[PDB]
């Protein structure tokens, strides 16, 4: 019954994508969504049996890599971790497969479309059912190749395959990253395999050699898994593929990137947390990276007016939030936070993809407006959704941000400072670019054309059901899970993840602090929603500073241009790197130095030495 | 276009609709049904539960490794 | 015609073998290289024995493997330094 | 009266019989260093 | 939508880009087709029926079952 | 019109080495914040005892001997 | 236009020859001297020097002496 | 009883057969040498079956005398190290007479004739235990490769391209048979399985060392020697590069395993951190360069010198994971790159061009060719699930365990051998349709189709359940891990 979780969603692409010629644009449709819900509701009896009845099951199928003792075997593992990972990725995935057959009703090329996200949903499944580190990289590395094709599924266009060609590459480098990690788990141990990595995580205590330089064995390989997930979770080092990535259909959006794929280094993080848990120095690295990408996202999406754009770094800061989560070693939390994200984002881009739909394909904020009245209930959900990422009280984003914060306010270190600030004012920005973006769509006076009013059609069915299903977790599904999973030596987990004895806060994260610091993310939500409406609904709009102050204008392009990464991250490293190609390696290194030297260049002398010899 | 109705794809091309989708639609999900008796028959055998569950669950109907290797010191 | 079965290797070191010159009986260094190669993959089988017993104490046990496979554990990684053909730690077999 | 026993009986009966071949090596190895060393000692007679 | 006929009676294009024979006859094979398919059976038949069949000779099995038999003698 | 030698890899109000500075600016704001993180020290801030264990901080039970 | 082969520009044609025929292209200037001189004599000393000195660090840990790699 | 001697002769008897038969009679002659390709293919499979996992003895082993004193004979033996080679050489072939079907009425009976010599010589090669013999049928390959170089090439660059080929093999081959020579002359014979007893000075192990590295590295382009197979590759038939690439790329690293990493185990140690600076550039510079190539064939040539320097930091790691590990890739490299080839040459059959500049949005005309391209340019860049992962991942625990470093550097490989990869299907799969340049299409034929399917099969089932390969070579591929050592 658990092989028919990993297995239907590729069957059904199997069948969709070498038998779509038969079924049409419809059968093909049918078959995945088919699919991928048996696989749902069978993930809810695997939810009912493993992580409630508290009974994990270990499956394995057949030996993969045998060599003397690199061992990786088809093994799939599901415990009280994989199981909620199983109902999340499954439950968004047919959720999305319902929403794009009416999202997809007039793309020609809609049988594909279904193949690629069936199959993007098989390698999320064998990413999360994952025994060893090596099944693991493969659906680590499948979901990007998954996403690299569903990125440019409109391959005519030139942005979209720009777009899937860096995150291929930012990927790829985080795939070295992990393949390293890897590499060093085997040289410790001498397995692959998780149950006795885990086991055996606490006894080695040496030191190695690596890259001229002398590290601990432990830290350099939790260091080193790090940067993979930093590489697929889109964090401050390796980020800027993510809000390109948004060239790709909405529903491409709204599983690939907000629920799924993103959610993926937190997960490795959190699984790998019997080993994580051995190395304090990787810890600080992780705190401070999550930290500075919440933040960093959190500035950089509060002057965007794409539409999509927007919500991509409100998922960027949510990742952040999630993984400096993990730094203060409470991953139970973090879960929780990807578990409550992959409703109220989901839902999120889904409303957004329905606003856009519904408006000719319209993605710009400064073009809608007043689509209140047209749009009720679409409305209705972006306001459910904004009002849960913001955090409002007593829903599912307060159960586990607030939880986030009051915790690493308890850190008392160096690292937890850092991380609290940046996570209290990303809050704030958060609310203000989250409270901006449903003023200008919804509520300010109409800034659109006649032509998009016109032709207005909210949801059908099909584009409904799936909303309305994401707005009931979003409403009630936090309060469910808050108990099962952030309580207090709650064993809903059992030994899926570990936190030593010795830096557990959670406790003192409830009654340890004043009632100021569990207050300040709702009073920061206030003041930010405060400002959006005094600077869009009414306001003189003294723009005229942008048009005669300097720096006003490069402060504006500071924060609308990524931080300036991509700019100079290209100019510095990918042109160096093309030039690097010809100007050198082929200009000079093999092009006439060797040949001058070689058989033709100065060897020819031969003509000039054999004609010779009639003296 | 003109021409995209002269290309041979497995997919199916641009604006595929066979007149017979839905006889061809059941077909599919039969074969599905097919192939996936084997894989949950296979499932049941390989599985190990070392952990007896707390309330009876439905795998019990089929699975029958249910409490097997408590004794982990005879492990091969 | 091979008898059915698994393959049959006398075990014992062969005679005429000597490691101060190692290179003087030709047949006896073929075959002492077989052999030792065969011990070291028995060693590697116990290794992964061991292995299989640690990750099945790891799974039964749950949250007590702490205290439960600390005996595996020792014995495994003990086993594992002189696995063979790995790290720089090399077996004196 | 399964295609499984005969391919076994089969395979089994192709497959070449193991110590006949290690004591063919191994009187290889005895035969080739006697006729090196012979014809070393060849090579070492003089022209003259 | 969902109830409508579709319109498109066979798949667009041939298979392989060759066009059907005549009504009432075959497509007439090439030259290499049939030593090509006669070659890809049998070697299908010979890797499923002889490599199940031939005996688990490995240095991963002898091995395993000498360690198996030296770890429980030690005891 | 003959193609040129490199035609194969073929924020306009900024340059590269203005937007460099621009971005060193940015990561330096992060550098101060973790300076000044470092100024406060909040280890020594810290307003309860660690958290002690029983049974030899649970020794037995974390793989200690026994 | 019952053919298949393509209609070959002599703008695309020409630059890929160009781009083909670039072995009788050195004029041995400096920057060509300096950077065979450094990207394909100095990086590979310093590479060779990583692994050697990789080996040494090694050697050292377990307490065996160096190894003499050469 | 089927032993190498039919094998052998198999090829013989199909390229004897074609060369009395009038040439008028074009059917017969393809078909008489697919069925000689064909029984050959079937032959080598046979061998598997019948190949013994437990004995580091040579087996099937055959003695034809040479010399009238015995010295030097023809003995003829496979281990669990050219076994896959030479089914590998086997099965290449049928594919390449596949390839020239249509178009054979012009090349006649000497294209046919030339492969299966061709075959003769690359399966003796692998087969020899003689040092010599192995240089004789080493260096016997130039001639009929020579011919189809220069005979069936495309422009009249092919006689400056097989020049440089044959002279670059040959300067390599005569300082190889010097140091052969030496070593006939002091041990006394030439037999591998004596040579392998035969304890050697130190001072004689340098220079016998670099003599042989001399020759092999040629043909495994190390750093500056590989501009002979750019412009030799490129100058070739479609068929023609498949043997090249798929075959002639392995001699090199085949004689590493069997005639430097074992004769000489103190050298070999003394020349790893050599070998692992040469390899560590080579994978940094040429999947760098292969960047800046517009040449279509002449990409994926760059994408070979990558790949098969990943697999000389395999051998000289010296452990399971390493040496065994870089067998899976040269068997991998020996599929996924003789597919692409084949994939170039559906091209270039059609559309007489190979830059990449006329090449865009076939994935609109062509889509099984799209597929079926897609899915080795998966293979190319070491996906999981595909053979060259597993090769490419395991020579890295190879590496990984001896340095450090080294394996930090091969890494990078993987790095930017996604970025060409991918990057070429996307400018000649994907994009939009040039009519100005060229505008009429034909998809995968049924030749197409069926060539591309045992390609298709062998590389996920070598990629997803590599273990019937792994245990027949891990009882050969351990004893050559130790030699010299006796602990
Ligand atoms: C190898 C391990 C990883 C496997 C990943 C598989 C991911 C899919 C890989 C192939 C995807 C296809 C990409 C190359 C072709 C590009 C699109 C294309 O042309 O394909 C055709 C053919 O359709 C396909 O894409 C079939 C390939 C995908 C379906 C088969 C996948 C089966 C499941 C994946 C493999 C199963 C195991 C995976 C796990 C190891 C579709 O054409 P249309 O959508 O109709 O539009 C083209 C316009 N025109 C019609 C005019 C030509
Ligand atoms: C129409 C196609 C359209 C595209 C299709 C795409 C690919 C779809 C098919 C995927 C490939 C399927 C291959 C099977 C892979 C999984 C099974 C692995 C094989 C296996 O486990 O069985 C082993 C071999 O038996 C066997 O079953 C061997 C039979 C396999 C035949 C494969 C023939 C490939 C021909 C390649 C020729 C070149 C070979 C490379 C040189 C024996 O298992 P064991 O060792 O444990 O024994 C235990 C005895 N107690």
Redesign the interface.
């Known amino acids: 019954m658990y092989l028919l979780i990993v297995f239907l969603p590729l069957l059904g692409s199997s069948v969709a994508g070498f038998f779509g010629r038969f079924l049409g644009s419809e059968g093909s449709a049918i078959m995945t969504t088919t699919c991928v819900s048996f696989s749902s509701i069978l993930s809810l009896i695997a939810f009912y049996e493993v992580a409630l009845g508290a009974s994990a099951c270990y499956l394995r199928i057949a030996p993969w890599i045998s060599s003397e003792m690199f061992d990786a075997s088809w093994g799939f593992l599901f415990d009280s971790l994989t199981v909620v990972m199983l109902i999340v990725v499954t439950f968004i995935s047919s959720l999305v497969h319902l929403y794009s057959i009416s999202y997809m009703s007039e793309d020609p090329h809609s049988p594909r479309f279904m193949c690629y996200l069936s199959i993007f949903t098989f390698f999320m499944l064998m990413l999360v059912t994952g025994d060893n580190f090596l099944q693991l990289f493969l659906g680590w590395e499948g979901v990007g190749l998954a996403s690299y094709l569903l990125i440019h599924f409109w391959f005519t266009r030139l942005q979209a395959d720009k777009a899937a060609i860096k995150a291929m590459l930012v990927n790829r480098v985080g795939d070295f990253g992990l393949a390293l990690g890897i590499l060093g788990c085997f040289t410790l141990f001498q397995t692959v395999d998780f149950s006795t990595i885990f086991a055996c995580a606490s006894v080695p205590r040496n030191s190695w050699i690596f890259c001229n330089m002398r590290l601990n064995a432990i830290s350099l390989i939790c260091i080193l898994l790090f940067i993979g997930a930093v590489g697929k979770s889109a964090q401050i080092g390796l980020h800027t593929w993510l809000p390109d990535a948004m060239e790709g259909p909405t529903p491409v959006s709204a599983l690939i990137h907000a629920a799924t794929m993103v959610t993926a280094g937190v997960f490795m993080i959190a699984r790998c947390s019997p080993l994580f848990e051995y190395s304090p120095t990787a810890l600080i690295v992780i705190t401070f990276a999550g930290a500075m990408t919440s933040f960093l996202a959190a500035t950089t999406g509060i002057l965007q007016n794409d539409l999509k754009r927007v919500i991509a770094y409100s998922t960027c800061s949510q990742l952040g939030y999630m993984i400096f989560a993990c730094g203060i070693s409470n991953y139970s939390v973090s879960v929780f936070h990807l578990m409550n994200h992959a409703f109220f984002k989901a839902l999120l881009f889904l409303s957004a993809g329905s606003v856009i739909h519904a408006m000719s394909d319209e993605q710009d904020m400064r073009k809608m407006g007043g689509l209140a009245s047209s749009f009720p209930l679409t409305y209705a959900m972006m306001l459910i959704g904004s009002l849960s990422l913001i955090g409002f009280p007593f829903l599912t984003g307060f159960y586990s941000k607030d939880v986030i914060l009051e915790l690493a306010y308890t850190k008392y270190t160096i690292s937890g400072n850092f991380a609290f600030w940046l996570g209290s004012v990303s809050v704030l920005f958060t609310s203000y670019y989250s409270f901006r973006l449903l003023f200008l769509t919804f509520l300010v006076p109409t800034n659109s054309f006649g032509r998009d009013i016109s032709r207005c059609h909210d949801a059908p069915i099909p584009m409904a059901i799936p909303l309305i299903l994401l707005a009931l977790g979003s409403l009630f599904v936090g309060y469910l899970a808050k108990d099962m999973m952030i309580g207090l030596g709650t064993n809903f987990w059992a030994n899926s993840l570990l936190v030593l004895p010795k830096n557990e806060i959670l406790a003192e994260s409830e009654f340890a602090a004043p009632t100021i610091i569990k207050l300040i993310p709702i009073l920061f939500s206030t003041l930010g929603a405060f400002v959006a409406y005094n600077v869009n609904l009414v306001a003189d709009q003294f723009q005229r500073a942008f048009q005669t102050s300097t720096f006003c204008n490069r402060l504006y392009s500071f924060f609308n241009k990524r931080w300036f990464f991509d700019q100079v991250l290209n100019d510095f490293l990918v042109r160096s790197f093309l030039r690097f190609g010809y100007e050198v390696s082929f200009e000079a290194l093999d092009k006439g130095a060797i040949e001058i030297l070689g058989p033709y260049g100065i060897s020819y002398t031969f003509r000039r030495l054999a004609e010779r010899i009639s003296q | 276009g003109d021409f995209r109705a002269k290309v041979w794809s497995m997919t199916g091309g641009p604006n595929c609709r066979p007149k017979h989708w839905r006889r061809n639609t059941a077909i599919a999900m039969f074969g599905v049904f097919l192939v996936c008796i084997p894989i949950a028959k296979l499932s049941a055998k390989l599985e190990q539960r070392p952990h007896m569950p707390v309330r009876p669950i439905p795998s019990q109907i089929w699975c029958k490794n249910f409490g097997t290797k408590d004794d982990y010191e005879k492990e091969h | 015609g091979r008898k059915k079965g698994l393959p049959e290797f006398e075990e014992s070191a062969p005679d005429g073998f000597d490691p101060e010159n190692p290179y003087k009986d030709p047949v006896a260094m073929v075959e002492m290289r077989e052999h030792i190669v065969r011990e070291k993959w028995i060693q590697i089988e116990k290794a992964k024995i061991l292995r299989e017993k640690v990750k099945w104490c790891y799974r039964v046990e749950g949250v007590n493997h702490y205290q439960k496979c600390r005996h595996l554990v020792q014995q495994y990684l003990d086993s594992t330094r002189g696995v063979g053909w790995g790290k720089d730690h090399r077996p004196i077999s | 009266g399964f295609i499984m026993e005969f391919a076994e009986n089969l395979v089994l009966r192709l497959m070449e019989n193991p110590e006949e071949r290690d004591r063919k090596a191994r009187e290889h190895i005895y035969e080739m260093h006697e006729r090196c060393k012979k014809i070393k000692e060849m090579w070492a007679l003089p022209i003259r | 939508r969902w109830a409508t006929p579709g319109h498109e009676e066979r798949p667009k294009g041939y298979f392989m880009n060759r066009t059907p024979p005549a009504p009432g006859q075959s497509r007439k094979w090439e030259d290499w087709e049939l030593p090509c398919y006669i070659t890809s059976f049998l070697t299908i038949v010979i890797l499923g029926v002889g490599l199940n069949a031939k005996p688990d000779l490995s240095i991963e099995t002898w091995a395993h079952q000498k360690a198996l038999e030296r770890l429980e003698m030690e005891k | 019109k003959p193609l040129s030698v490199n035609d194969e890899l073929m924020a306009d109000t900024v340059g590269k080495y203005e937007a460099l500075a621009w971005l060193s600016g940015g990561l330096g704001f992060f550098v101060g914040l973790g300076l000044l993180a470092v100024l406060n020290d909040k280890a020594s801030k810290v307003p309860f005892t660690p958290r002690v264990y029983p049974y030899d901080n649970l020794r037995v039970e974390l793989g200690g001997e026994p | 236009?019952?053919?298949?082969?393509?209609?070959?520009?002599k703008?695309?044609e020409?630059?890929?020859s160009?781009?083909?025929n670039?072995?009788?292209?050195?004029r041995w200037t400096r920057r060509?001297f300096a950077?065979?001189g450094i990207?394909?004599i100095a990086?590979?000393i310093i590479?060779?020097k990583?692994?050697?000195?990789?080996?040494h660090?090694?050697?050292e840990?377990?307490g065996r002496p160096h190894?003499?790699?050469? | 009883y089927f032993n190498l001697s039919g094998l052998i002769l198999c090829p013989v008897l199909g390229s004897i057969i074609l060369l009395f038969i009038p040439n008028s009679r074009i059917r017969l002659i393809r078909l008489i040498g697919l069925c000689a390709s064909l029984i050959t293919f079937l032959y080598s499979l046979v061998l598997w079956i019948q190949f013994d996992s437990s004995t580091a003895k040579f087996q099937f082993v055959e003695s034809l005398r040479w010399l009238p004193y015995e010295n030097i004979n023809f003995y003829l033996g496979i281990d669990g190290i050219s076994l896959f080679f030479v089914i590998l050489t086997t099965f290449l072939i049928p594919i390449c007479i596949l390839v020239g079907w249509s178009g054979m009425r012009s090349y006649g009976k000497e294209y046919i004739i030339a492969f299966l010599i061709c075959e003769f010589l690359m399966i003796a090669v692998f087969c020899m235990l003689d040092l010599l013999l192995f240089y004789v049928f080493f260096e016997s390959v130039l001639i009929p490769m020579f011919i189809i170089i220069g005979v069936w090439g495309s422009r009249q660059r092919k006689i400056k391209a097989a020049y440089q080929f044959f002279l670059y093999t040959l300067l390599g081959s005569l300082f190889m048979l010097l140091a052969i020579l030496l070593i006939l002359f002091q041990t006394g014979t030439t037999d591998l399985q004596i040579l392998l007893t035969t304890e050697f000075s130190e001072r004689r192990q340098i220079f016998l060392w670099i003599a042989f590295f001399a020759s092999f590295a040629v043909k495994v382009p190390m750093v500056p020697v590989h501009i002979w197979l750019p412009e030799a590759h490129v100058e070739a038939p479609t068929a023609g590069s498949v043997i090249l690439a798929g075959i002639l790329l392995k001699f090199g690293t085949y004689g590493f395993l069997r005639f430097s990493i074992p004769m000489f185990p103190e050298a070999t140690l003394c020349f790893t951190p050599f070998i692992y600076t040469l390899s560590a550039i080579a994978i940094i510079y040429t999947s760098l360069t292969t960047l800046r190539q517009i040449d279509l064939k002449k990409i994926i040539a760059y994408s070979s010198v990558a790949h098969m320097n990943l697999v000389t930091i395999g051998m000289f790691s010296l452990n399971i994971q390493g040496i065994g590990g870089s067998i899976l890739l040269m068997l991998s490299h020996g599929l996924v790159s003789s597919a692409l080839f084949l994939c170039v040459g559906v091209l270039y059959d059609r559309h007489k061009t190979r830059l990449v500049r006329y090449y865009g949005g076939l994935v609109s005309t062509m889509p099984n060719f799209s597929t079926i391209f897609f899915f080795f340019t998966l293979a190319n860049m070491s996906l999981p699930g595909t053979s060259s992962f597993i090769g490419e991942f395991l020579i890295l625990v190879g590496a990984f365990q001896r340095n450090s470093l080294v394996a930090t550097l091969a890494a990078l490989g993987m790095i930017l051998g996604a970025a060409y990869s991918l990057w070429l299907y996307n400018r000649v799969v994907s994009g939009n349709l040039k009519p100005d340049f060229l505008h009429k299409f034909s998809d995968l034929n049924g030749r197409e189709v069926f060539i591309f399917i045992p390609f298709l099969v062998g590389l996920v089932w070598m990629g997803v359940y590599p273990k019937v390969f792994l245990d027949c070579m891990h009882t050969s591929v351990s004893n050559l891990v130790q030699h010299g050592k006796f602990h």
């Not at chain 7, 236009?1 to 520009?9: D, H, L, R, S």
């Not at chain 7, 670039?22 to 050195?26: G, Q, S, V």
């Open positions: 236009g019952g053919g298949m082969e393509t209609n070959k520009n703008f695309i020409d630059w890929g160009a781009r083909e670039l072995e009788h292209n050195f060509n950077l065979i990207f394909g990086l590979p590479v060779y990583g692994i050697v000195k990789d080996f660090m090694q050697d840990d377990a190894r003499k790699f050469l």
